[PDB]
Design a binder for this molecule. Structure first.
Ligand SMILES: CC1CCN(C(=O)NC2CCCCC2)CC1
Ligand SMILES: CC1CCN(C(=O)NC2CCCCC2)CC1
Lengths: 193, 193
């Protein structure tokens, strides 16, 4: 049923680990999923549409994990507060590196993928800015830059730096160092004057 | 002569302001440059090769401007030191937004463009790290993160945030606010404990 759907998705995520979407075929996806090519087309219009769904699931998984954290304060200092939050993104995207990688590239060619990234980025930035503002209101953070602008740059840093690290780009921060690196820059830029 | 070359380059940069490289033709470039299509192919193997050269020129212009700054210290505090430096990139790339935009997209499809970006990014990060280290050695900056790792994240932030701003992506820092935004995060993360 939608078991077939789940299978198409699992096959695509598995195949994306080995090669880019350009070198994966609908025949490849159908085969791996144990269905014919016409049956594939019943569930998805295109292999592009498969990636879109995989990216949607990863993005929503991150978002739901962040919502959980936001509802349950971990009983910490400001550094571990931000760390735990950044770590949601580090772990979620880091657990799905092939979807992350293919979904990042697809931004250039797919308006739907571009808009999905854009929608969630705006949400995560707004949440970052709300937290910074609450930190300023409680007297914990100084009123320096506009919170939303600061939040924008810090989120864009995270996007670029996490994904470079996961892809092993040259240059990149080693994956085992990237959390500490980002948390330092967040805590210093948010609390520093 | 290489006047024709310069003309091909000017035409391409002009046309990239209006549409992506995919919708610009060799006939478009030849026409604008006042030459035939075979004459074009004498000077460049492909329209992809034209972009590569345009990107090479912009990247080297930034690099040369940074070398000039590095040879002549501006007589300032630490904040204006970093600002003047970031401003080299803000002004150089900001003066060539269409090449910036097309060259960023071309990373995904062109190994030569990927390697060009990568070579200069490594140079600029190494220079950033050298400056941070000299700041630490003089007792002006605390020994926090590994300088090279800090330098990596800050450069990757700048890349992503400048180029989002220039493209007017949603989300992005307004172009008129991006310099102040980046300088704050650099100065706080470099000098802060
Ligand atoms: C796809 C991006 C989205 C933003 N990212 C990220 O680490 N920011 C978090 C930090 C903790 C509070 C919410 C936002 C990087 C990955
Ligand atoms: C293409 C990138 C390269 C790096 N960028 C940049 O602003 N960094 C500068 C800051 C001043 C010292 C040298 C490095 C962003 C644009």
């Amino acid at each position: 049923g939608d078991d077939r759907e789940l299978a198409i998705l699992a096959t695509a995520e598995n195949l994306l680990e080995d090669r880019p979407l350009a070198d994966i075929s609908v025949d490849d996806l159908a085969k791996g999923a144990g269905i014919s090519r016409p049956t594939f087309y019943f569930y998805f219009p295109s292999k592009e549409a498969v990636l879109l769904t995989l990216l949607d699931r990863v993005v929503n998984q991150a978002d739901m994990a962040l919502q959980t954290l936001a509802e349950n304060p971990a009983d910490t200092d400001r550094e571990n507060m931000w760390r735990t939050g950044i770590n949601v993104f580090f772990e979620t995207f880091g657990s799905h590196k092939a979807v992350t990688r293919a979904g990042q590239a697809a931004r250039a060619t797919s308006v739907e993928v571009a808009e999905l990234w854009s929608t969630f980025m705006q949400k995560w930035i707004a949440y970052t800015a709300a937290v910074i503002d609450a930190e300023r209101d409680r007297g914990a953070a100084p009123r320096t830059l506009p919170a939303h602008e600061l939040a924008t740059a810090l989120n864009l840093m995270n996007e670029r730096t996490l994904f470079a690290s996961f892809a092993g780009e040259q240059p990149s921060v080693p994956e085992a160092r990237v959390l500490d690196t980002l948390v330092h820059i967040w805590v210093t830029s948010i609390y520093g004057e």
